[PDB]
Design a binder for this molecule. Sequence first.
Ligand code: PRO
Ligand code: PRO
Ligand SMILES: [Cl-]
Lengths: 258, 251
Amino acid sequence: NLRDKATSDFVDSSGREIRQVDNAMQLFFDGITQNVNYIAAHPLIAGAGDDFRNYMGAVATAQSENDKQATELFASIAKAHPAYSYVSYGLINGSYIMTPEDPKMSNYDPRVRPWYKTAMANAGKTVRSDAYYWANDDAVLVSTIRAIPNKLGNPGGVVNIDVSLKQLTNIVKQIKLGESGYLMLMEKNGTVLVDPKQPEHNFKKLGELGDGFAELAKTGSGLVELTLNGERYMANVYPSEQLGWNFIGLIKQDEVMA
Amino acid sequence: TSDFVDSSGREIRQVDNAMQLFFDGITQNVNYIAAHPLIAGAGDDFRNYMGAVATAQSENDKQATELFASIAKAHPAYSYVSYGLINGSYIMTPEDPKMSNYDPRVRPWYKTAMANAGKTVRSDAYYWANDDAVLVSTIRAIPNKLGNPGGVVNIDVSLKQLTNIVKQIKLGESGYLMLMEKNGTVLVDPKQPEHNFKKLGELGDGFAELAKTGSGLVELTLNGERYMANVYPSEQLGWNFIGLIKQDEVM
Ligand code: PRO
Ligand code: PRO
Ligand SMILES: [Cl-]
């Protein structure tokens, strides 16, 4: 009874707080989605042809005036939005526009990248990618992407605004459940996006972690009682339908029972 | 009772953060528009609506209007995107070619920006009679070819749009939030939006009782039902959230 009341208070309180964090994250990504849709309708982008630089080999192809103008468009958007890591556009001929610009990039084909394949599978809709690694700058990124028509074909290319796991950690690290509790963020597939207490877990699979975290992977929703990191914890698994991610609120049982 | 204050505050804190992220997106797009070559490079050739009939539309006016229309199209929560200049000329979407007797320089969003040069800021809520709309602007005064500052960029959101956002926010199991300016002007009452842009103390019933509390708990009867309220100031938005939960639910 008293145990039940303390437990239901945690589940109720943490769920009510997490649902507002879910809403916050959705508004953040809504703004990104809307800016991808703005870029996708822009005349330099919707009207793109075969004259953008191609970085598939050792040296980029020659830079056209249209490439310069599209690069500057993306640069100006990125300047106004410091939470964006990259703004880019990959085309079906392998050409690419990117900010921060890298005139020296080599051996890069956007068409083989996971964000590009995801957009093509969802053509005409603006969606988010699974988290993926970008080796060149040692970065784990989540893309907001849209495959669009242009002069090369329909679909002709994919617009992409990238955010780093660092931006997600900013929103998540704020939440304190009591004095010991915290919030984890995972993809449905089990990939950890944010562990604010043990960031070494970032971009690893929940079902492959030690210390009891693998048992969290079995729960789709609601309360879990479990031992974690050598201590008794309670967890509240909160799925975000719209983000396609799961929040997990974690707290020491010691704190709940006091 | 004291648990309600602590519990509702934890929820409203994250609502505050959510609303900040919404407005942060608008601030950043104002800053984008501010640096655009059609805008930062604007001169003396935009349409002037101060008389009974607008002046003739130039090519630069056409291109700036199309820029704003494209931004607005991608952002449905934006009610207007506009730009007023120190010579009284004006660019706006949705475009109104028939507008008359309009000078942007006398308007509250414009004067607020000029009073905060160097910053992108929000206006107090203000009335736009031509569409019977109440709007909160995000503005920035900027240099252009006419002067430094030479004009003001403005993205407007209406109280109807804010009400759509706030309506969806739950508090506790059945509670809800009001959004208030510090001077008592209601921004959002999601249950009775006829209260929007009225003064709390003039709404009678229990609402006047909320009008005298700057922060913390209020126990009151709202529309014949006993309610508990937590008045929560937002430092960053400069508004108060009022979290309301029926006292039956609290106990
Ligand atoms: O990973 C990729 O393919 C792109 C390139 C810049 C960062 N994101
Ligand atoms: O009220 C004003 O002055 C501007 C005009 C469009 C709506 N906001
Ligand atoms: Cl309105």
